[PDB]
Design a protein around this ligand. Structure first.
Ligand SMILES: Cc1noc(C)c1-c1ncn(C)c1-c1ccnc2cc(F)ccc12
Length: 120
């Protein structure tokens, strides 16, 4: 286990770019990490965004969030660059603004400030 609840991470999920997240406990399983059905470790994350979402992400697709400028280092992992669709970019910028604020808080503060409320 490399990450704990409240840690800030970048997650690369599906067709989306590296996105700012917070590691959190799954509301149903009550664990923030598990071994999946393929025997790989996954972490449960909340995505920072105007649209609240959560996901279980493979450990190879999770990186420590040190700051927004780390994004260039993540892409690096003629020069070819994918375009940045304006609508997605605006939501990513909003997520980054939250992560930048969360980075200035302690773990306990971030947990209190950002942990989602799940309603059945
Ligand atoms: C959508 C969605 N629904 O479930 C999940 C899980 C996702 C998701 N998977 C990866 N990312 C980065 C997201 C996502 C989460 C929150 N906000 C967003 C805003 C966007 F513009 C674009 C993607 C996202």
């Amino acid at each position: 286990v490399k990450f704990q609840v409240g840690d800030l991470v970048w997650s690369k999920v599906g067709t989306y770019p590296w996105w700012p997240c917070m590691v959190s406990s799954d509301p149903q399983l009550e664990v923030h990490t598990k071994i999946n059905t393929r025997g790989a470790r996954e972490y449960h994350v909340q995505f920072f965004s105007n649209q609240p979402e959560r996901a279980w992400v493979h450990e190879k697709r999770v990186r420590e969030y040190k700051g927004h400028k780390q994004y260039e280092e993540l892409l690096a992992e003629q020069k070819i660059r994918k375009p940045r669709p304006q609508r997605e970019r605006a939501q990513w910028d909003i997520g980054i603004a939250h992560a930048e604020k969360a980075l200035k808080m302690t773990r306990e503060e971030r947990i209190e400030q950002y942990t989602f409320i799940y309603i059945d």
